[PDB]
Design a protein around this ligand. Sequence first.
Ligand code: MG
Ligand code: MG
Ligand code: MG
Ligand code: MG
Ligand code: MG
Ligand code: MG
Ligand code: MG
Ligand code: MG
Ligand code: MG
Ligand code: MG
Ligand code: MG
Ligand code: MG
Ligand code: MG
Ligand code: MG
Ligand code: MG
Ligand code: MG
Ligand code: MG
Ligand code: MG
Ligand code: MG
Ligand code: MG
Ligand code: MG
Ligand code: MG
Ligand code: MG
Ligand code: MG
Ligand code: MG
Ligand code: MG
Ligand code: MG
Lengths: 67, 96, 107, 223, 45
Amino acid sequence: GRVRTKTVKRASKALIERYYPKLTLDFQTNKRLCDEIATIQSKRLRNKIAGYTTHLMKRIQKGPVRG
Amino acid sequence: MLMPKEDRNKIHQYLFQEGVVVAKKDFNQAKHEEIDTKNLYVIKALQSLTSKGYVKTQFSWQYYYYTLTEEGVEYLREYLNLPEHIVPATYIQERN
Amino acid sequence: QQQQIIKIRITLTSTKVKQLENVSSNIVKNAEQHNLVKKGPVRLPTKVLKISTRKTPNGEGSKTWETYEMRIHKRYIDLEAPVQIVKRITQITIEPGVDVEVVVASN
Amino acid sequence: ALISKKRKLVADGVFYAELNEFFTRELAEEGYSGVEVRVTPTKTEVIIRATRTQDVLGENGRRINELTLLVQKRFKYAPGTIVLYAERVQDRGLSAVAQAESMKFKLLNGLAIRRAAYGVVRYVMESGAKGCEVVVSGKLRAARAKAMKFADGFLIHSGQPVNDFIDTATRHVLMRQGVLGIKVKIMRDPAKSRTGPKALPDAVTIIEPKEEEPILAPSVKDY
Amino acid sequence: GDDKKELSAEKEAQADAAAEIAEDAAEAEDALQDYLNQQANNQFN
RNA sequence: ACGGAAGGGCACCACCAGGAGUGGAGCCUGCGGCUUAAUUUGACUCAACACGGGGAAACUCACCAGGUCCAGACACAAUAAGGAUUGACAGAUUGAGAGCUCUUUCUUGAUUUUGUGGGUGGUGGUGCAUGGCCGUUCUUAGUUGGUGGAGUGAUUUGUCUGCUUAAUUGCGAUAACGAACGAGACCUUAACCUACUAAAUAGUGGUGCUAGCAUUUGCUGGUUAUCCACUUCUUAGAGGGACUAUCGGUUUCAAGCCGAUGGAAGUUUGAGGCAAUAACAGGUCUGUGAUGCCCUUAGACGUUCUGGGCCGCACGCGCGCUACACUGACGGAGCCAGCGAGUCUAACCUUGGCCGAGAGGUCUUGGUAAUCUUGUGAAACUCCGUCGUGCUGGGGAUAGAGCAUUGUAAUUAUUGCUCUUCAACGAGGAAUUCCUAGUAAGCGCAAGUCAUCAGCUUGCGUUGAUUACGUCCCUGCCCUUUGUACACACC
Ligand SMILES: [Mg+2]
Ligand SMILES: [Mg+2]
Ligand SMILES: [Mg+2]
Ligand SMILES: [Mg+2]
Ligand SMILES: [Mg+2]
Ligand SMILES: [Mg+2]
Ligand SMILES: [Mg+2]
Ligand SMILES: [Mg+2]
Ligand SMILES: [Mg+2]
Ligand SMILES: [Mg+2]
Ligand SMILES: [Mg+2]
Ligand SMILES: [Mg+2]
Ligand SMILES: [Mg+2]
Ligand SMILES: [Mg+2]
Ligand SMILES: [Mg+2]
Ligand SMILES: [Mg+2]
Ligand SMILES: [Mg+2]
Ligand SMILES: [Mg+2]
Ligand SMILES: [Mg+2]
Ligand SMILES: [Mg+2]
Ligand SMILES: [Mg+2]
Ligand SMILES: [Mg+2]
Ligand SMILES: [Mg+2]
Ligand SMILES: [Mg+2]
Ligand SMILES: [Mg+2]
Ligand SMILES: [Mg+2]
Ligand SMILES: [Mg+2]
């Protein structure tokens, strides 16, 4: 599978919540974002996180998303 | 055990001198590193010396560790006869 | 009045890659940080001591196997310094966990 | 002299193992808690992490004599080349091994099984552990063997942080009936780590934005 | 131990820990034979 | 908690579609059984049977036939310096050049001896007294507290119909909201860097000195430093990289899932390590100088020494090895790995030279090792020949005769070589195992064991498929529902 755990999804929510100006449709920049704006202990988890706080953006751009 | 006074003293004396003895568990070892007797001689000699107080024994990885204790510090004083205010592991080196 | 270029080889061996690379790197600066000449840390292929055993003290059960391993890391640094710096550079720089060995000679 | 370094590095391991043993057997009523042996120029350095170094010393510093002398004779060291110092451990409260031997020694003055363990967890906590676990196993007083658990606070149990943050230790308190198994688990507050990861890998902190007071039609400052 | 007397344990447990903090803060400050051996056999030699 | 009720699932220790087999045969090896002086013993459904790292010539070792020793602490008592006790040469004796015991008669000097109490050792018993460890449930996904809601209460709700996932993984629903343990994260290994830092113990290009062939400049080599440079390849440091990205089908346009493109990599990226709460009278007292209790303790169940035994053979069972041939055997020729190991107070890994058909021997030698063995020139495999379907030149059991190696010792034949002998076996009934890609299968190699001995194992790389990409029919487990007079919980 590839269902993203709660830790991933919980951070993502928490980032989109308090930094929507800043952040984008681009994971490439959202990666670099997370580093400055968030303490995370692994490269891997950071990517797993940014990639999904990205995906979440990507469709807010077309309608809202609960949560 | 059965062992001549000669070997008893070579033990006993060396005990008072060093204040300490170690010795591997392997009876029939002919001559023991340092002391000039049968290894079997040392082990049991001490075993006796402990079983009447005097000295303390420790094992771990196949080796005996005999610690000369204070009441023994008297017994050796009798067996070797040497006068009180003698010695043991009871110096502080020069200034080491 | 002393000092003469004696051609050195410091060999550095350990299982603790931080402390090792530490003593390694700190040395390489403390070389040209006073201008020597060297071929730097040469990392030898880190080798692995494997040990493969049944877990069980006895016989019962599906035969589970368990392999422990111990890694040996070895660098060598070549220096060309006189007698004063060398002896200084060997006695200090010491570290609990890193075995330092300094040979000399042109053979 | 002259050894393979494969043989040499293993050999040094064993040496530690044999040494650590001998101390754990010899300095129990001294809250022995570990060693490290530093190979140096001109000497071999041994440090005894015992809580109560007053006893490791002795009448004008006797015992460490016997102790070195012992350690000396055994591995064949040439008087002077081996050196022992004792060194009181900074809080026994966050050291598994120190606490099992407490637990042991508790139960050997016959403390109630719980009052024992249930105490240790409480003292460890006040030593600022993030969490702590004690198990007692085997047989007290009844005939059939039981086992208990005694935890409080926070622990994790898997992967690398285990290697990182938890101290565990089994001891064997040899009782009149059979033998008890004591088994302590301390989980160190990773905040304080001092040298390593600062948190659990699960830890994801977000900086708290900034209360903007924006708007304001352009303008520019000169300098 | 039975759960009927538990309270009494947990409290004595605490007290136990409290007096382990007396010890560990009060130890956080609190307050020859000459001649040798291989010599006496060389002096009386 | 349980059911020989019901409803859902999940999995190549289930099946489907297949593969490659085992079950038949020879032998190897374990287990039963018989046998025996003894054939030491544990373990018996998955979870006992190439398992106790269990490949036992002595040792191991426990078992059997025999012989010594005390290594019986310590305390009192007895004995006793007119000698408590110790040892012996030769002979007899004995398997023995054991003064075991006897003859004889020196020696030793308070160390012992006799006795009781008390210790002590023991692969003696008890794993149904224990610790620790392990294996099993578990290829599973479960466990809990805060504030709130229900209940006098134990308790429940959160933790759920559905959907999704490898996952109590999420989505969603929603009297719950929000969190922690376990899952995930993490860690290690295999993949990608012409980016960074370097290397005579890694290697490339150039240049010298040089060989061969062409000569027309060339082509192919030699040269642990004859110099210059470089880091692509090798090595291991620090970084980076992937997040199922872009796009699109799909779907409660949710988690997600499928496809395409790109990418070193898109099945948790592949394989591992660690792994919560709980259960079992699972296994181990035969790993432990871990341990309670019982047994035993000098004609010993201590220990050691000699010799046999664990291998004994009407036969049942299990893991294996080699095979039945022509996708073959044989004989020449091609000629390519990776994981490893290796000698200090010592004989380890062995290049090279010679002698020997061989196995081996002998003279030297490099290596405490990316430095030498070793490019481990391994095997399948590839090439050209011989044989031609004939139990054949497939197959190599059984057996005779010789020569070498390890070891104090090889007989009941440790192993190796040569000749010879040349069995069963013509693809294996009922049954049954394993597996989804660099996988299956074929194929060798190192390592553990190891003086000698792998038909075992743990890892490794070499050659490289077929068929799924599904489901609940079989089998096993999990989940709700439901019944219970069980709760020591259907033993
Ligand atoms: Mg966790
Ligand atoms: Mg994990
Ligand atoms: Mg089928
Ligand atoms: Mg078949
Ligand atoms: Mg025998
Ligand atoms: Mg007696
Ligand atoms: Mg008695
Ligand atoms: Mg025992
Ligand atoms: Mg059991
Ligand atoms: Mg057990
Ligand atoms: Mg039994
Ligand atoms: Mg599977
Ligand atoms: Mg209420
Ligand atoms: Mg529930
Ligand atoms: Mg490179
Ligand atoms: Mg593609
Ligand atoms: Mg049982
Ligand atoms: Mg055991
Ligand atoms: Mg057998
Ligand atoms: Mg061929
Ligand atoms: Mg010949
Ligand atoms: Mg040499
Ligand atoms: Mg034929
Ligand atoms: Mg043939
Ligand atoms: Mg071998
Ligand atoms: Mg085996
Ligand atoms: Mg009910």
